[PDB]
Amino acid sequence: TNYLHKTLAHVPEIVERDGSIGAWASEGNESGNKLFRRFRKMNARQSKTFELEDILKHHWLYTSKYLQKFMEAHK
DNA sequence: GATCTGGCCTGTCTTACACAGTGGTAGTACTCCACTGTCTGGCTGTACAAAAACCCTGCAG
Ligand SMILES: [Ca+2]
């Protein structure tokens, strides 16, 4: 199998070269994609002409540091 | 005697139409920017009384 081959043959090379792996996890996008699941439910327009547009808007809004910083609010 | 076919019902599906919502927009109406004076009422240094509910005490029973 593939990943097995990667991990028994190719781990050391990349770990040597590009600093760190798992650092570049795809985990983030897929894992977070459940946000695209929920946003469609709650804040839809709704009409697919807009459904994207407003979903993307809310998403990026939820994504910037700035509002996350203001969400922490002194721990 | 034993079976065909319209007349009529209803149980099942289906199809228009209604609400349901949501971010965007327009139309509307209710809150102040700032100027200037100016009146009203609640704070501050002790003194005099007025009410008030319990407590003692006399004296009445
Ligand atoms: Ca995946």
How many Å apart are CA A69 and CA A56, to the nearest integer?
20
Q: Give whole-number Cα distances, A58 to A16, A18, A49, A71, A75, in Å.
A: 39, 34, 16, 16, 24
Report resolution in angstroms: 4.3
- Asked if strand B comes closer than 7 Å to A51 Cβ, the answer is no
Q: How far is the CA of A62 from the centre of ligand 1 (A)?
A: 22
Q: Give whole-number Cα distances, A12 to A15, A17, A23, in Å.
A: 5, 9, 15
Q: Cα(first)–Cα(last) distance of chain A, in Å?
A: 45
Residues with CB under 5 A from ligand 1 (ion): A 30
Is the alpha carbon torsion for A4, A6, A7, A8 positive or negative?
positive
Residue A53: Cβ within 10 Å count:
11
